[PDB]
Amino acid sequence: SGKIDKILIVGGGTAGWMAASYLGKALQGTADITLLQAPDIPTLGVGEATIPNLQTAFFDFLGIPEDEWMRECNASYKVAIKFINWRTAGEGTSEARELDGGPDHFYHSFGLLKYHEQIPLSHYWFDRSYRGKTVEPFDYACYKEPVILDANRSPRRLDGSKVTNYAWHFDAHLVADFLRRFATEKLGVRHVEDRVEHVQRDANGNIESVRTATGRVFDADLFVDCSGFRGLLINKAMEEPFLDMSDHLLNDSAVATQVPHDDDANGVEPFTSAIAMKSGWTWKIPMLGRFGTGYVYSSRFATEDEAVREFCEMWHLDPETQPLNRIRFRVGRNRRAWVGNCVSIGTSSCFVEPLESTGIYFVYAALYQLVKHFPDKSLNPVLTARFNREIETMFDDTRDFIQAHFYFSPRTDTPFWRANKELRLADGMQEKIDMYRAGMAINAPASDDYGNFEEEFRNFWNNSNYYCVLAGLGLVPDAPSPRLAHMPQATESVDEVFGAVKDRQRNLLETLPSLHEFLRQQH
Amino acid sequence: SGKIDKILIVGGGTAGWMAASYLGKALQGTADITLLQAPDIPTLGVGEATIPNLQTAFFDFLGIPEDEWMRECNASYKVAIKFINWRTAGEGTSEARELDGGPDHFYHSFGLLKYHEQIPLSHYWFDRSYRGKTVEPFDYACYKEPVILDANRSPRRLDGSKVTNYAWHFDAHLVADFLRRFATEKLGVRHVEDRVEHVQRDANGNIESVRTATGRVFDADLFVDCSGFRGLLINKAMEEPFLDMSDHLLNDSAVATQVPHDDDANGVEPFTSAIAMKSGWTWKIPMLGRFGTGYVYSSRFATEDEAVREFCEMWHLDPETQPLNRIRFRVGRNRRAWVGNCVSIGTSSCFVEPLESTGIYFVYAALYQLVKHFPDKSLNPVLTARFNREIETMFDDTRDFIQAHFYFSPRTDTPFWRANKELRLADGMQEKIDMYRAGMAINAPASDDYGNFEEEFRNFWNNSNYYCVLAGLGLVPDAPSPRLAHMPQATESVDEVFGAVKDRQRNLLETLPSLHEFLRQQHG
Q1: Which positions are catalytic residues (chain B)?
Q2: Is B391:B460 a contact under the CB 8 Å cutoff?
Q3: B340 in Cβ contact with B307 (< 8 Å)
Q4: Total domains in the fold of chain B
Q5: How far apart, in whole angstroms, are the C-alpha atoms of residue A513 and residue A516?
Q6: Quick check: A376 and B27 CB within 8 A?
Q7: Which site among A221, A434, A483 would you substitute to test the B interface, given the most B Cβ atoms closer than 10 Å to its Cβ?
């Protein structure tokens, strides 16, 4: 026993330096931290989309202002994820097809859903919809974001004031470098360039040390595995098994690239695009002067060649000369994230396709859970088990949520879209759906007011999130919430709360600058 | 599948009238409600202890201000529960024995546990206690309440401002009366005084109608059972099994009464007392000029007569002339609270000894869940199942918390106390205990700031509650939270926090009027 004196982080990508920075800040001056990383074959900056608490739960914790890291990571703004062509049949194209008089898209934005007499606006929307009182989509009726996003507006006025919740788009490599400099320079984290040659464990199954290719042996009390999909420590050394989640998620591959973009001519979209394809979907992450894009697909329904072709044709790129990143993912999670004195953080722990921008979130959320369940040398088993429970539900809930994007799509045009309907939802997901169909809110927020992590983490996917995606795809309740028939005054008075959103939509549309205009001035 | 048009409440006591008022307010003008109440012999006003959200979740929902109901119900103020003699051997006495150079008591109050650098003050306390940097009890070090309660101070100044969180003490019969007037006179709930003699069910097994002794028949779309331990609808008619849980709680009985009290000479205690006995514990609920008291015991360890003797002797009452209520109750909950078109609310649904003042809470908490999961005539199975799940965890968590009060008592002097140690905690409770011993908080509040029910129902028993009774009884972590050894700046500044509470204790002690003092005014 005695406190943890030394920590060794293995792996130096985004997760590695995020861990180095978070732990370095949390245990400042009370633990010696070293990170081991060797040169990997370089990849293109295909983009990363994020969520609001990246600032409040991560950069704020580090004491780094939004403007400080944005400027050095050449970041752009994200207000939502625009889902394109998830309800219509056809080829993989960047242009939205037509559906019921308008483009086939729906937004899942960050804006929150206001209550009315203790009930989510979603329920009132559906009540009117079901009774043929409105035909307006859920997102446009309940959020002000869609209208201003259709016009590529900025989430901030030129004077800097914020009008909507938003997150970021950026090249992950730049953030990693920014953090590497911050950790080594400001937090005293020791960076060592070496390749793991051997991991020495003891009779208790814990890691004693790791010997590198140069012969240096690194011993520590706690080992953090940020080696990525390889899982050098957690899977390879500790032999912890990985749980393949292919019975819920068919997508396991990707071919991506970065495309130059003239922002002066076309402007910049304040949102991540999730473009439905024939055997998966494609992301478009707008940055400054370019956009990252990647086709996430299922190797079971498309060969790598076919994916490359579909992806390149969609963007009018030459398959033979376009610099491409061909990736095969390890989808799922370890049976246990933390075993013995080895904690896995990042993709070494778990991974799911970036359909809902959880990649970086999974890292700082887990780091928050590690510090909260921080052990000493006795390694109390309870801290470890509880940590694993939080990680396990964090992932499985996201897994379920994501599967629902595919399971509930109305498309039947390709073998892929049809196969998704043939998979089964996890029992916990089916219950949420049962609830949704019964007119109940799903994990409704206690308040309609991203500032407190514990609260966010505990209620990550809430009623708003589920309605955006579910209603967006077309899945709606079997009937209105029975409680509304007993609230005539409330259903009469909503007309003015739906009116407030319309006014906000109109006023923001006519007063906000374009995202490009705002970026152009800030620069 | 029209909406619910008619609702029949069976049972007209505290739960019955709370259901009538809550439902009448929630469905006002969209449902006809009738309450069927049988005239039987009332009990003595033995007193009810409550929790803060009684006002925010129930009375505020009805639109009834705190002053309006507590004046008409002659209620007093509660700031905490004072646990007396749970750590020392001896007979059942109203007086604290001595332990470690001090009286054997500790408080579990409503006050909030301050966070420090994102960590509950409780953790810093134990860190120092574990290192011999202090010898002060958890409650006195982390709360301002303990000292001003030792002096019977009012939770609010004469000008009326609140200096502490608090709940109420009152005679349940009076509140039920108040709620009956409200429901019948202002909400249109029809009161029928009659006795149930026959309940007819349909082919689906749902309740078709209930016929009374006078031959009247009532029908409805939804039947709420508020008949108490009898479970006339849910258990008898619907045949839903009641799940006894004496494998977690040994107490199944009580001898109770109301004792006159000289407030002018003794003042009024702003707390409920839970006095450990030889085969149970005794509550003391101070009201105006009297205090309700009752001895909760286990029939397998003490005879009814042994209990009345023990109870009377501690309060110096005469067994032969003191009016006494002798009760035998079922401890546990129905396998399902809501079945078909029958919803059980109150003790018809579940019951656990009043050691943590959850009786009335179980009623409005359940009524809140009922309205949230309110159905239409199709009775969507999903709404019923979810409701049932909320009630079941609402109850099981409390059952567990309460069992902990007995399980972790150091006493070994009687068969009763030794017997509690041989029972087993439920897996969930065992996990919580493991967490606690590891220095972890348990269901820590997402914030250190009772106004938002949904949030409270989820985090009902939080870290401060567990520490108050667990540490109060003497169960503390195996070692300080591992994280504190990595927060020298935090464990340095924390002392400021402790000094701040010691300051507040000081001021409030010097400037607060006695509760009696404030009470006289609240009425005159």
Answers
A1: 78
A2: no
A3: no
A4: 1
A5: 8
A6: no
A7: A483
